[PDB]
Amino acid sequence: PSHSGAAIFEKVSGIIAINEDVSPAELTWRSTDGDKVHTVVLSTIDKLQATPASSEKMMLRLIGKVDESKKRKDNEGNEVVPKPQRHMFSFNNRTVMDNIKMTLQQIISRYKDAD
Amino acid sequence: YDSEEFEDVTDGNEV
DSSP states (O other): OOSEEOOEETTEEEEEEEETTSSSOEEEEEESSSSOEEEEETTTOOEEEEOOTTSSSOOEEEEOOOOSSSOBOOSSSOOBOOOOOEEEOBOOOHHHHHHHHHHHHHHHHHHHTTO | OTTTTOOOOOOOOOO
16 A cells, blocks of 8 residues: 555545646545545645644645736735645654655655656 | 744645
């Protein structure tokens, strides 16, 4: 079990598994019971997030692709960038987080190296 | 300040 770890979503603990059988490596969260599911495409994931063993809180997150071809402010008068859609997850182990954090990155660079 | 309870990872291009 390398590219797959039990990740939490919406307060529920499911199963995070990277679909490396398709063109663009994806990330599919399949609940433990099978009542909750979620899909994530690393192709859009601009950045990755993971709480190292140094962090008492074990939780992972992925930054999705936004759009820097519009630009705007925060309604106050500060030119900022549209918040990128990210998927926040929660892990319950030190090794589990490493399984995804170390595996996801494998897909991350998969786009940078090519791009 | 969500960095104290979360670390950063290799992000896309910037500079």
